[PDB]
Design a protein around this nucleic acid. Sequence first.
DNA 1: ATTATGACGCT
DNA 2: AGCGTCATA
Length: 430
Amino acid sequence: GPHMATGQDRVVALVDMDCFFVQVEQRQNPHLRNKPCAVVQYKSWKGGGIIAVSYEARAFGVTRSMWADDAKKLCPDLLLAQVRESRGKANLTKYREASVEVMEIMSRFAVIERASIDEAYVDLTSAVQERLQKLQGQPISADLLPSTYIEGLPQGPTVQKEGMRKQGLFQWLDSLQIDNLTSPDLQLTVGAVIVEEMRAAIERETGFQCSAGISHNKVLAKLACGLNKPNRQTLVSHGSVPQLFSQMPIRKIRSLGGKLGASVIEILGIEYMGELTQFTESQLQSHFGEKNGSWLYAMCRGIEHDPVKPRQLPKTIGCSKNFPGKTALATREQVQWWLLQLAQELEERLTKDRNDNDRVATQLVVSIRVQGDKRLSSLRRCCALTRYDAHKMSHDAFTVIKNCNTSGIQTEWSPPLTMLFLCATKFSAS
DNA sequence: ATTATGACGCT
DNA sequence: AGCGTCATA
Ligand SMILES: [Mn+2]
Ligand SMILES: [Mn+2]
Ligand SMILES: [Mn+2]
């Protein structure tokens, strides 16, 4: 009873940009605003590959990983912005720099964990305590939560969407006990007030809209964030978890979207997150391992302890290119030319990183894929990264992969390379 | 012929 | 270390 950990110790948010690369291009080019629009990479092959889609375009059924030629069949007036190409390859610098804009604003409110190019977790526990003390037991007005959904509400004894949101929010605020500074529901609510402020700052200062989730841990915050995209935020309380999870496919939870999630479904013969509660911790550990089993046992009850790491910067800087079909690299000079291209982009990004962030990478990882291999990577080798010099790095990368060439004579490369990848790792302060 | 990333876990 | 898994625009 009094000793059941309920995982309500923290307030955690996840802020995720809406259709992020599209918004970056729409800010740059006002003609793309409020239009069905997508961002594409390359063009020659089937119109290019779509990697981001505006919500207007999603209404036509356009998705990521769709060829633009096919997207145009669903949406003839679809507008397209192309990813920059430099040194023969897609270059994502504009989006990385836009990401930094957003991450630096979020960092003014709390220490953040950069989780992708367009999202970060925030531990708001401390900030909530201070806002609460400042609050002096004054109720939280609905006006402080103008874009917030309370998951699970309204419920019990209007056909418009904004009307429903307000009803739910009213029920939530009506039930709150603002008298108790240690009340988790209150703490989440104040967390949501801060995230409204955060999201307003991001939009004011960048032009970019985002969504967010507020809960007691990262997995619930991430899940919450997606519930009312775009341009809205969602509070998932501890109490909302049983109903929420009772019809939530297991694959929707972060980390369960792949083989593990499929094995949970197959081995246990269940479909929804909530169904996990009927297994003992030892039962889950027996099937999925000690760590996974303990994680599942707590997660299906709404509990997770994974901390928000204080890391705002990526800990690796990498450059990669596929060489699909018959563009696969079959000669030495080809392989060497592309290693140089990759190395030159890597040097440029590394040098900028050193100046901005007072650190130096010390290890170079070289990865290739060979024709026939289903795996993402066929081979990964490391060597020392001692100088930010593209020609040295590309020469070194070649040295480490030299022996993968099975051809008798050295001018040819066989079997042809379908992927090159250079990654700088192991940063030290400088 | 989705591609270009990036983090974390296992052994 | 090198490989595998999972994730995101
Ligand atoms: Mn996003
Ligand atoms: Mn995201
Ligand atoms: Mn996405």
